[PDB]
Swiss-Prot record:
Tissue: Widely expressed.
Tree of life domain: Eukaryota
Residue ranges occupied by any UBA domain in the UniProt entry: 6-51
Induction of synthesis: By diethylmaleate, paraquat, menadione, sodium arsenite and cadmium chloride, arsenite and arsenate. By MG132, MG115, lactacystin and proteasome inhibitor I (PSI). By serum starvation, okadaic acid and glucose oxidase. Also up-regulated by RANK-L (at protein level). By etoposide and trichostatin. By the parkinsonian mimetic 6-hydroxydopamine (6-OHDA). By TGF-beta.
Name of the gene encoding the protein in the UniProt record: Sqstm1
Residues the record lists as Phosphoserine modifications: 20, 24
Protein name, UniProt field: Sequestosome-1
Localisation: Cytoplasmic vesicle, Autophagosome; Preautophagosomal structure; Cytoplasm, Cytosol; Nucleus, PML body
Range of the intact protein held here: 391 to 438 of 442
Disruption of the gene: reported phenotype: Impaired induced osteoclastogenesis.
UniProt source species: Mus musculus
Length: 53
């Protein structure tokens, strides 16, 4: 039962670009997104607009 939330070295690298671009991790949408996009900046940028529809 950890406090707050942790991250990884091969993950924060991506978030650094998102947060600077104008994003965040409210709720945990950018804490797992990158992990699913193989820590990508161009793929994560197109994961906020929508999902399928």
């Amino acid at each position: 039962g950890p406090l707050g939330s942790e991250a990884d070295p091969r993950l924060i690298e991506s978030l650094s670009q998102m947060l600077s671009m104008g994003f965040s991790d409210e709720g945990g949408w950018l804490t797992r997104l990158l992990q699913t996009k193989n820590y990508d900046i161009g793929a994560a940028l197109d994961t906020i607009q929508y999902s399928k529809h």
